[PDB]
């Protein structure tokens, strides 16, 4: 008997020349690492958002290790440079699941380092499910523009189509892609998320709208178990995440460490917007992030 060809990732590079993490689902995940070149104060991974992927956070995983923090990422499931069906997900548990594996795996590496999460979009929510799932264990949570409440009309729209769906057999349904420009009214991060090929920018899968919709729910029911200290920084103009939902997560959550940052006229992409509010915006999760490992 021979061995079988090296698992390759959907972009045909072999997961053996990567770093990477096989999910309880034998799902290879591709990871990153930036760490520092002393011993880290913490440890802090970096969940992106739907539909891109984690080398996104370059400049932000840079700034964070400049705070000899160790920052670790992987492509969720479906998405990037992991396995999976593109944008796909069995149940959106998968993807708490699976950073909870990461996270585990690298306080084995690293013992006795506080561990903060920073999420944005879905990877906010993602990062909520996951600070509720173990209460007290979170150093911190930096949440960017997260998941907690769809845009309206678009939940509206979506929601009619859903029970569409969830009443007879329509595998390959799918809503209309998001119109990039509402990402941020920087238009050349704009362009740039036009042109990066790891971005699958197809509309959303009926199933995964769902899978979505699962999410929006569960934030909800935990934001009463929700204790992490957290920094929330959100945009007033964005129509991808109402900001409706940043002030819902204020007042819910039980936290007594909680902090919002409004950036009046922002779009969604707030590491990615115009410079004064990206300037703001990393040097705001330094003094957060700076503040709560000293
Ligand atoms: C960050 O990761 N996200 C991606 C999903 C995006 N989004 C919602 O929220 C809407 C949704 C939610 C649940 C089911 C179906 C649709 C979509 C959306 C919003 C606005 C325009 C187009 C698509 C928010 C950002």
């Known amino acids: 008997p021979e061995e079988s060809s090296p698992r390759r990732t959907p972009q045909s590079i072999p997961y053996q020349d990567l770093p990477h993490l096989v999910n309880a689902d034998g799902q290879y995940l591709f990871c990153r690492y930036w760490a520092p070149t002393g011993t880290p104060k913490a440890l802090i991974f970096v969940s992106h958002g739907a539909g891109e992927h984690s080398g996104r956070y370059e400049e932000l995983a840079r700034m964070l290790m400049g705070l000899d923090l160790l920052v670790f990422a992987h492509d969720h499931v479906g998405h990037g440079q992991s396995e999976g069906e593109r944008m796909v997900v069995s149940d959106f548990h998968v993807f708490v699941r699976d950073v909870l594996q990461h996270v585990d795996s690298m306080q084995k590496d ?3 380092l506080p561990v903060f999460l920073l999420g944005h979009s879905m990877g906010g ?3 909520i499910l996951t600070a509720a799932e173990r209460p007290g264990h979170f150093a911190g949570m930096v949440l960017i523009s997260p998941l907690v409440l769809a845009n309206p009309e678009s939940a509206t729209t979506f929601k009619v189509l859903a029970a569409k769906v969830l009443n007879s057999v ?3 349904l799918s809503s ?7 990402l941020s009214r920087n238009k050349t991060e704009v362009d740039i998320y036009n042109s990066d090929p790891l971005i699958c920018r197809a509309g959303l899968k009926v199933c ?3 899978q979505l919709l699962n999410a929006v729910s ?3 029911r935990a934001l009463p178990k929700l204790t992490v200290p957290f920094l929330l920084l ?3 103009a964005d129509r991808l995440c109402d900001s409706k939902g940043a002030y819902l997560l204020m007042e819910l959550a039980k936290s007594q460490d909680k902090t ?4 009046e006229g922002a779009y969604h992409v707030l590491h990615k917007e115009l410079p004064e509010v990206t300037n703001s915006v990393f040097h705001e999760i330094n003094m957060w992030v700076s503040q709560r490992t000293a």
């Open 110 to 112: 690293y013992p006795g």
């Open 125 to 127: 929510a993602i990062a």
């Open 170 to 172: 329509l595998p390959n």
């Open 176 to 182: 209309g892609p998001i119109d990039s420009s509402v």
């Open 208 to 210: 995964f709208g769902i």
């Open 218 to 220: 569960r934030v909800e």
């Open 234 to 236: 959100q945009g007033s």
């Open 260 to 263: 919002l940052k409004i950036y």
